[PDB]
A paper describes a structure:
The system studied was a reversibly switchable fluorescent protein (rsFP) which is a representative of a class of proteins that undergo a reversible photolysis reaction from a highly fluorescent “on” state to a weakly fluorescence “off” state. The specific rsFP used, [name], is a mutant of Skylan-NS33 specifically developed for ultrafast time-resolved crystallographic studies due to its ability to form crystals that diffract to high resolution (∼1.1 Å for single-crystal cryo-MX), high photoswitching quantum yield (∼18% Trans-to-Cis in the crystal), and high protein expression yields. Structurally, [name] is similar to green fluorescent protein (GFP) with an 11-stranded β-barrel surrounding an α helix. The chromophore of [name] is formed from the Ala-Tyr-Gly tripeptide at residue numbers 62–64 in the α helix.
In this study, we probed the light-induced reverse reaction, from the Trans to Cis chromophore conformation, initiated with 2 ms 405 nm pulses at a range of optical flash energy densities (0.1–6.7 mJ/mm2) after the initial Cis-to-Trans photoconversion had been driven to completion using ∼13 mW/mm2 of 473 nm CW illumination. A total of 435,200 images were obtained across 6 laser energy densities at 405 nm of 0, 0.1, 0.53, 1.78, 6.74, and 14.43 mJ/mm2. In the preilluminated (unflashed, 0 mJ/mm2) data, signals of the residual Cis population can be seen. This is due to thermally driven ground state isomerization occurring within the 10 ms duration of the X-ray probe due to laser and X-ray induced heating (discussed in detail below). We conclude that the initial population offset seen in the crystallographic data at 0 mJ/mm2 energy density of the 405 nm illumination is due to increased thermal recovery caused by X-ray induced heating. The crystallographic determination of Cis concentration at zero power density of the 405 nm laser is systematically larger than the spectroscopy-based determination. The difference between the crystallographic and spectroscopic quantifications is assigned to the x-induced heating, which drives population across a 91.5 kJ/mol barrier to reform the Cis state. A clear difference in reaction yield can be seen even when comparing the lowest flash energies (0.00 and 0.10 mJ/mm2), where a difference of 3% population transfer is determined from the shift in the minima.
Author numbering: 1 to 61, 65 to 222
Write the structure that this text describes.
Amino acid sequence: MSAIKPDMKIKLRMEGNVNGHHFVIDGDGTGKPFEGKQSMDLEVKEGGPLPFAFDILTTAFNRVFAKYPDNIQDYFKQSFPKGYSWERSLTFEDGGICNARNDITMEGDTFYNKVRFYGTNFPANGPVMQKKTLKWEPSTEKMYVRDGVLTGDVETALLLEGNAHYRCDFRTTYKAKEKGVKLPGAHFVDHCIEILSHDKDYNKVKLYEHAVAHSGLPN
């Protein structure tokens, strides 16, 4: 019997600053850790309407919601009940840079998330500050160990209006709270993130993510 139930609740608070614009966003959702699926309702509480593309934030709103096969060590499920934290750099092709972190805890059937998101050096004429993004392309996260730390690299892109892509490189470090959770072997995580619904200025958003771990093969 596991600390992690087939159905778990999610409670989040994000505070952040992009190009000097302060905001606070709350989230409430549910997910299925063993199926690799989560959805959540987000609401901007302060700083709305946001003057930048909501899409830059969405990967910051937990790899516990990833379907892991038996033959890959699941570092994220093994980290509970005490939990884990991640730190992420997002590097955009036009010099925009973000730093995000999440400290994740579990109380009963609920994951609590303390999220911080800091963004700077977005050009005022670029697609983030002009709100020209449409979605993230599905991508594959490469997981590996660097200097004894579990590291995930993604090379991906935002689709823009007008048949263009805006490229972004992600690097995330993941750290169990508990001393002694064994690191996994190198592997991949396929993921897809989608905004299912939104209101006029993206003050209320429903967000969905699906993630599957694998070793790079078909069988």
